[PDB]
Each structure stands twice: as C-alpha cells, then as structure tokens.
Amino acid sequence: KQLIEFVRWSPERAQHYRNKGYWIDQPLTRILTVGVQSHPHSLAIICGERQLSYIELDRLSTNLATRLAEKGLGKGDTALVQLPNVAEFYIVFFALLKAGVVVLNALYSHRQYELNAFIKQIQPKLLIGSRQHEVFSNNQFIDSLHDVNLSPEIILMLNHQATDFGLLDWIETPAETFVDFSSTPADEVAFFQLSGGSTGTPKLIPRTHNDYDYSVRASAEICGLNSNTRLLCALPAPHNFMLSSPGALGVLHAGGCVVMAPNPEPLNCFSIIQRHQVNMASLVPSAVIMWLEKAAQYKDQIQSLKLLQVGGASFPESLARQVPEVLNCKLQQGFGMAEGLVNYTRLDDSDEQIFTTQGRPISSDDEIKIVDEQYREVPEGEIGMLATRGPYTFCGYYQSPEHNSQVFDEDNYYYSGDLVQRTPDGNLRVVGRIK
Ligand SMILES: Nc1ccc(C(=O)O)c(O)c1
Ligand SMILES: [Ca+2]
Ligand SMILES: [Ca+2]
Ligand SMILES: [Ca+2]
Ligand SMILES: [Ca+2]
Ligand SMILES: [Ca+2]
C-alpha cells in the first residue's frame, strides 16, 4: 500500500517546474504509448536478428505486466533486474513501469556482493536474471537468500532451465485471468538509479517519472534525435548515460531505433554499425580509444556514423580532435551524473567549445554553484567544487539521511564532488574530482 519513500522537491520548486513545462506528470510509459499511436510499425529495437516494432514492444511488455499483476505484484513492491544488452532488458523495464513495480537495474558485471547489498536494501519480491551469469550458473546465491528470509516470491530466468521460470515464457503469452494494474504516480518514484564513483557499493538514487522523463525529453532535443536516429547501445544498458542522456529512452522518445551490441568491441561494433547503418553512438573515452585504433582499417564499415557522444571520464582536447578526423563523424562532449545534472556541448557550438569543454546544463533552470573549501563562490574562471540543483536533480539518496546531510547544503544544492571551472563562453570544463 505504501509507495516507496524518497526525498521530495519543495512545492515552490515543484510548481515552477510544472509551470515551465518540465514536469508534465506522465508515466515513463508515455514513450511507448505515444510511439504506438504515431508509428506502431517503426522499428523500436534491433537485437541480433530480431526486429521489434513499437507495438511489438508494447504488446510484449504488457504480456509480462499482466502476469506480474496476476501474481499480486504491483505498487509498493520492488524488483531487482540483472539482464545483458538484449531486447528483453527493455521489455522488462517497460513491463515493470507499466505494472507499478519500482525496479533497480543492476549492471550485468555486478557480482554477488553488490546484488546482495541491493536485495538487503530494496527487499524485492521479483528477481529477473540470466542463467548464463556467473552468479546464477549454480543455485548457491538463490539458496543463500532463503536462509535470511530475503528469497523473492517470483524468480524469472533468462536462458532458463526446465525447472526455472522462463522469462521468455512469461513474455510470449499474457495471463489467463485479468487483474488491473497501473504505473506509480508521475511525481512518485519510478525506479532506482545507481550512483557512480561511490566508495562502497553504488548508492540508490530514486528517479520519479516527472524528472526522468524531463531529462530524457531535454536530452533528446539538445542531441538532435529524430525518427531516423539509429543509436548503437554498446555501453551497459542500465547506465544513465546509455538510458537517458539521451540514451535508448531518448531515442524511443524521438521515434528512432535502438541497436543492441554486447559491448564496445571495435570489430563487432563496426559490423553491427555497417549491417544496420547505425548513425549515432555513445561512448566513454576508454572505448573511443579502442575505436580509434581500429577505425582506419575499417573506415567503410563505420561511414554511416553521424554523431558520437563522449562523456564519463577525461577526454583531452588532443583526443577530441581525432573523433571527426578518424571516425568521420561529429563530436558531442558530455558530462553527467546519475544523481541528476547532465551537461552537453550544443550541436551549433564552436569547435573550440566542442573540443575543449564538456558543455553546459540541459535545463535553463539547472542551478550551478562553483565554490571553494570555505564554501564560497570562486571568481569566474577559477577551479572549484560543483554544487547543483534543478528539475531533474535528486534530493537525497534512498534511506541515507546521514550521507544526505553531508552532500546537500541548506539550500539543497547537491555537491557532486567534481572539480570544474566555467569558461568565458559559459561552458563548463570538468578538471578533477574531490572527496
Ligand atoms: N550524459 C552522461 C554522461 C556520463 C554520465 C556518467 O555518470 O558517466 C552520465 O550520468 C550522463
Ligand atoms: Ca518482429
Ligand atoms: Ca517525435
Ligand atoms: Ca560518417
Ligand atoms: Ca579523415
Ligand atoms: Ca559523482
């Protein structure tokens, strides 16, 4: 009965964000619904040899949602999902959003310790994973949960065994009996994001439909997505970068197509890019270097690339200038965080801006503060600590009142720990990290 707890925006701000059009109080399923009404047959996801249209995605995620509601799973409940970069990931995501289950998506590289900390935290009633994952190769992990009354009520397995509940079986056919189900309220938690750079296990970040949808819609505008965008998803699908800035959600919002790749392996990525004429991709600097090493020998397979998003680490100007030259495509530099703030160079910015800065905030109502150790605003140009608050920046970690009072100040600015400086053109440059 009780919806998931989280820290809220002040009503004064919540009104402002509604008045400005940022929060439109719609569930994240809006992306699916709106898509099925306009272009039900456009391809939504390409995965290997499979072609999922928008209405194909809608029907499949409904089948799963009706069977979860049939089992009594809905509002108030949580789910732990750990799937690889395949179409099933997005079916599950939209299926849980439809059913009102707050999902935490672990990284497919997370091992037993991390998954254990997540379960002890959200106490999920549903667990979706892969039998091909090391943790679910045997039954030791699933068994250890019973000893601590943390075992879930429903466990679905991809690449399942005869005994297991086949995830693909629950997706193909809907349930026999009818049960009503609905998303959580737009201004309530939709799912959990995972912090990056956390010393211990990643901390939980509650994302509501209102704020996440906004970052998706705004990211899509600044990154130029449209119904012809074919975006390669080579990074980990659950990551904020690959999902919402602009990510798969931004592409679907624009009526485009998501092309799945197991990882950013140059040769495989290059082949997928040529096969499906991928015209956009999003990478971290380490993967870009991998692509740069192989590009010259495979210029033809990657001709169709039109725009590359690079963010998430140091990207020196000497590397930036190689993207257009070697990868034959435009460069967009970004700097974001799962906690909220997302920065991007604009597609019309100068070459000096694109090649030596990480852009500027998505929202004109993103409030930025650059301070020193005496928590005072530094003179424009100098390096300082980044504090921010906006219409898509969280207001505190899940069930972490001690930590939250350390990273949030009285005015509720969030201190990312990132060191930055504001260039004359107004753009930000990320120059280091602090702790
Ligand atoms: N747009 C982006 C880029 C990078 C990150 C990141 O935290 O790695 C993000 O959360 C958003
Ligand atoms: Ca099909
Ligand atoms: Ca559109
Ligand atoms: Ca090109
Ligand atoms: Ca060239
Ligand atoms: Ca951080």
Residue numbers in the entry: 3 to 437
Copied sentences from the primary study:
Acinetobacter baumannii produces the catecholate siderophore acinetobactin to scavenge iron, a nutrient essential for several metabolic processes. The biosynthesis begins with BasE, a standalone adenylation domain, which activates and loads 2,3-dihydroxybenzoic acid (DHB) to the phosphopantetheinyl arm of the PCP domain of BasF. Adenylation domains have two subdomains, a large N-terminal subdomain (Acore) and a smaller C-terminal subdomain (Asub), which is highly dynamic, adopting unique conformations to carry out each individual step of the adenylation reaction. Several binding pocket residues were identified within 5 Å of the ligand, including Asn242, Phe243, Ser247, Val336, Val344, and Tyr346.
The V336G mutation further expands the binding pocket, showing improved activity for both 4-fluorosalicylic acid (∼9 fold) and 4-methylsalicylic acid (∼89 fold). This mutant also had significantly higher apparent kcat/KM for 4-azidosalicylic acid (∼40 fold), a trend that was not observed for several of our other mutants. Although the V336G BasE enzyme was soaked with 4-azidosalicylic acid, weak density was observed for the azido group of this molecule. As the azido group may be flexibly positioned or has the potential to hydrolyze to an amino group, possibly promoted by the reducing agent tris(2-carboxyethyl)phosphine (TCEP), we placed 4-aminosalicylic acid in the observed density, which fit well. We docked the 4-azidosalicylic acid molecule into our V336G structure, which showed that the ligand has the potential to bind similarly as our expected pose, with the azido group pointing toward the V336G mutation. The binding pocket of V366G showed an even larger expansion, which provided further space for the azido group of 4-azidosalicylic acid, resulting in the near 40-fold improvement in activity compared to the V336A mutant. When comparing V336G structure to the other BasE structures, we also observed the nearby Tyr346 to slightly turn toward Gly336 as a result of the extra space being present. However, the conformations of the remaining binding pocket residues were maintained. The V336A mutant bound to 4-methylsalicylic acid and the V336G mutant bound to 4-aminosalicylic acid were used to compare with the binding pocket volume of the WT enzyme.
